[PDB]
Amino acid sequence: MISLIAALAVDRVIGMENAMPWNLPADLAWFKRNTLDKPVIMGRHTWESIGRPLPGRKNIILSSQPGTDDRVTWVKSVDEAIAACGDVPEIMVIGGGRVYEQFLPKAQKLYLTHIDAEVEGDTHFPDYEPDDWESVFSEFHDADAQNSHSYCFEILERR
Numbered sequence: 001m002i003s004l005i006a007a008l009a010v011d012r013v014i015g016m017e018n019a020m021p022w023n024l025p026a027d028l029a030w031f032k033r034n035t036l037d038k039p040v041i042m043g044r045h046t047w048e049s050i051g052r053p054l055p056g057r058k059n060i061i062l063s064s065q066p067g068t069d070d071r072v073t074w075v076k077s078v079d080e081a082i083a084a085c086g087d088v089p090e091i092m093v094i095g096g097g098r099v100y101e102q103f104l105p106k107a108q109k110l111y112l113t114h115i116d117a118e119v120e121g122d123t124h125f126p127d128y129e130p131d132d133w134e135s136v137f138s139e140f141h142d143a144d145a146q147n148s149h150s151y152c153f154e155i156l157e158r159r
């Protein structure tokens with residue numbers, strides 16, 4: 001089963017690590033718990049953004065150029081990446097944008113963190129049809145002494 005996961009700001013916008021205008025430890029936990037002991041696929045830009053294999057998960061880099069680092073698995077295509085994954089119950093796609101769109105049509109599920117914040121960004125998560133997706137979980141949180149902004153966790157299943 002293929003899965004997508006992201007953090008979005010107002011208007012489907014998605015941003016970089018250092019760009020991360022927000023500060024939500026809670027979202028991170030959420031993400032870790034939803035990716036742990038699972039494979040994660042990602043673009044090179046994200047590779048780069050992160051700087052180190054993410055521990056406890058199989059890190060696969062989807063990219064057109066040859067790899068530049070033995071700690072990870074470099075893939076040249078959607079198909080190649082899914083194959084490298086082997087038989088697992090869930091594949092978590094983590095971006096970037098191009099990444100997202102390339103797999104959405106394959107996804108069966110979505111993990112989204114809705115963040116109450118307006119920001120200028122380049123990229124957007126792919127416009128996904130809400131009538132095709134069914135909301136199976138939600139949980140809203142007000143900002144707090146650790147969480148800089150209000151947020152909502154949401155999981156959707158493809159009807």
Ligand SMILES: Nc1nc(=O)c2nc(CNc3ccc(C(=O)N[C@@H](CCC(=O)O)C(=O)O)cc3)cnc2[nH]1
Nearest residue numbers: 005006007017027028031032050054055094095113
């Ligand atoms: N919901 C959601 N939130 C995100 O922040 C997110 N980030 C990416 C891409 N960027 C990143 C950047 C850093 C780390 C990182 O260190 N992750 C640690 C959590 C570390 C902590 O608590 O400091 C991990 O082990 O997963 C993960 C993804 C993709 N989907 C996301 N999805």
